[PDB]
Design a protein around this ligand. Structure first.
Ligand SMILES: Cc1cc2nc3c(=O)[nH]c(=O)nc-3n(C[C@H](O)[C@H](O)[C@H](O)COP(=O)(O)O)c2cc1C
Length: 364
């Protein structure tokens, strides 16, 4: 039965019937060439339409944004047409779906970049990690990331415009909301972090400069559509894919959050930890965040229904986004409400492949 996890929540322009959200989850099952969403993906999302809100897998705002083979885009006519079918399917089941838009920046490989050139970033520093590509048989594989090229100052407006255009495409595609991916070490986060950003122009140095790009993007997308259609995901505390938030992470996080609140966007999505773990958020920090962002706050990262109820009851967050539990349980809402057991997870099929480990997790 719980208490408040199953009560409606107004999220910007839409109203969620419950606070159990589906976190954005990269599954790398899109069609190549074209990075096109598939009917299988449409079925996967439709099965999970009872979620208070479905946040889609990270989706490219442009071809340059691509960093993983199999990840979908929302920049081409064919992609837009495919996503329209997916959102329609979710809506046919009375659900709501937001598209998470990203630019992977340095977490990419030249072989999947337009023209086969080096990927771009805030500075020319290799991520020193791996990304996922596909072999000749279409199977997912890990490959060391390519050293990026630092974006030139005159190239920045183009990046902002790519986000703006992607949001315009999202609107036509039928998405209820958009979530800017400003977390986990991808492009926006590469600029926010002092460890990945060594620029000496107005986009590097101070936190004001480091947050400049993401805020210009927020302003651009709010103008393109509406602030109440814009959400943003950040992971400002801890280290993510070799991208740490710096020696003043808490302070820098609060600066950004305060700036975001000024735009009156639909929501602030906090990814609290890397899958590898991280220091838990202090109740004091949660309080500081709460008071600086007057909109919906979504908490995520190894959450349990119990933890969600606790923090929601304390008025520190408004909803919770579950990732892996949603991969394995299409009807997670019903299971949590009924206290039913959950299907076991099969990590080996999280990335790539087909229907197995994707649409074959049964509902009650
Ligand atoms: C297979 C998989 C793919 C993910 N891809 C993304 C993604 O596309 N975008 C994102 O912001 N986080 C991504 N995440 C992080 C999840 O949104 C979520 O924050 C994380 O799984 C922790 O929550 P959980 O314990 O409920 O799974 C991914 C995690 C997993 C397990």
């Amino acid at each position: 039965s719980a208490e408040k996890l199953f009560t409606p929540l107004k999220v910007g322009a839409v109203t969620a019937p419950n606070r159990v959200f589906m976190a954005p989850l990269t599954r790398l099952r899109s069609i190549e060439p074209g990075d096109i969403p598939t009917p299988l993906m449409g079925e996967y999302y439709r099965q999970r339409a009872s979620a208070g809100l479905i946040i889609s897998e990270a989706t490219q705002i442009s071809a340059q944004a691509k960093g993983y083979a199999g990840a979908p885009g929302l920049h081409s006519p064919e992609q837009i047409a495919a996503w329209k079918k997916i959102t329609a399917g979710v809506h046919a089941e009375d659900g709501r779906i937001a598209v998470q838009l990203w630019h992977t920046g340095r977490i990419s490989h030249s072989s999947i970049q337009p023209g086969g050139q080096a990927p771009v970033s805030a500075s020319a520093l290799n991520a020193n990690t791996r990304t996922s590509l596909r072999d000749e048989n279409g199977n997912a594989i890990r490959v060391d990331t390519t050293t990026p090229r630092a974006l030139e100052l005159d190239e920045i407006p183009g990046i902002v415009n790519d986000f703006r255009q992607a949001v315009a495409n999202a609107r036509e595609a039928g998405f209820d909301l958009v979530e800017l991916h400003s977390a986990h070490g991808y492009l926006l986060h590469q600029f926010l972090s002092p460890s990945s950003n060594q620029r000496t122009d107005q986009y590097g140095g101070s936190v004001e400069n480091r947050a400049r790009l993401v805020l210009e993007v927020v302003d651009a997308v709010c103008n393109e559509w509406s602030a109440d259609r814009i959400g943003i995901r950040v992971s400002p505390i801890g280290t993510f894919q070799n991208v740490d938030n710096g020696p003043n992470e808490e302070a820098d996080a609060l600066y950004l959050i305060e700036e975001l609140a000024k735009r009156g966007i639909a929501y602030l999505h906090m990814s609290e930890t890397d899958l590898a773990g991280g220091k838990p958020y202090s109740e004091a920090f949660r309080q500081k965040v709460r008071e600086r962002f007057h909109g919906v706050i979504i908490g995520a990262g190894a959450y349990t229904a119990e933890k969600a109820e606790d923090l929601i009851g304390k008025g520190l967050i408004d909803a919770v986004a579950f990732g892996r539990d949603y991969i394995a349980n299409p009807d997670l809402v019903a299971r949590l409400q009924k206290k039913a057991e959950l299907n076991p997870q099969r990590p080996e099929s999280f990335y790539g492949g087909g229907a197995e480990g994707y649409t074959d997790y049964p509902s009650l």
